[PDB]
């Protein structure tokens, strides 16, 4: 018994590192970058959200997410516009274009997740899931 | 349901920031950096480990670990030493000095960890922490 061998925030950092570490050489290898990957997969099927909600979901930097935001407007993949009520808020979403431009990649990385969850089983893997997801919920700001 | 609400990187990636974050900032209100507080919780009660390891159970690039090494070596905090069969390998192990300068703060840990884990019941609790430990193991270089 070493203390990292069962201290909880090691173990979900190695998780995801080694996990997300897979699929983003997927991602560069048909030329996208983990930033861009991460923010047009985080827009795809969903309602315009906030800058603050996208960086939270791709856990960057908000200053970094804009900057990122501005290149990728640029490049015509995503949106930002005003909020209905509080133009304190910019909401963000992806065009056409960038859906297009990752729809493939999406197919791939579903694959790669049932590769990784299938050792596992529907059960655990359900349940991993949802403790992750509950986990999420009740920690974020 | 978008893709990105229940894809398993981004669960794993969400929630290990959000956690990890919550002890970071008590790590760095007790004078330590994220990366001295991993290094030497990684270390605590182990036997000596390659710089290679290190970096993995540190979530590190190995050579950001061995700068950081540089000077936590520097400060007594830490030795490397060579391996007794393959030298072109170095390990490294915490120092008395170092395990006394994180022992409280891994007390801590170990509080805000069982309040993370608190609200999931043991059951739940011991079904996360092996699932994540039997990924790692099952994803590791
Ligand atoms: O706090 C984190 O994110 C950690 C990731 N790897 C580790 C190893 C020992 C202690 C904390 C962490
Ligand atoms: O791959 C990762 O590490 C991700 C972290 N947040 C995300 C959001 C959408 C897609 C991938 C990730």
């Known amino acids: 018994h070493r203390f990292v061998d069962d201290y909880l925030p090691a173990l979900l950092a190695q998780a995801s590192q080694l996990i997300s570490s897979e699929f983003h050489e997927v991602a560069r290898q048909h030329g996208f970058s ?16 906030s800058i603050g909600q996208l960086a939270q979901v791709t856990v960057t930097k908000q200053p970094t997410v804009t900057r990122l935001l501005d290149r990728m407007e640029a490049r015509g993949q995503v949106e930002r516009l005003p909020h209905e009520s509080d133009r304190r808020i910019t909401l963000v979403r992806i065009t056409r274009k960038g859906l297009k431009a990752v729809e493939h990649l999406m197919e791939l990385a579903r ?3 049932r590769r990784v969850l299938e050792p596992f089983g529907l059960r655990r893997a359900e349940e991993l899931k949802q403790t992750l997801r509950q986990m999420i919920d009740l920690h974020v700001h």
């Open 34 to 49: 983990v930033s861009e990957w991460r923010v047009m997969a985080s827009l795809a099927g969903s309602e315009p959200i």
């Open 111 to 113: 694959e790669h997740e």
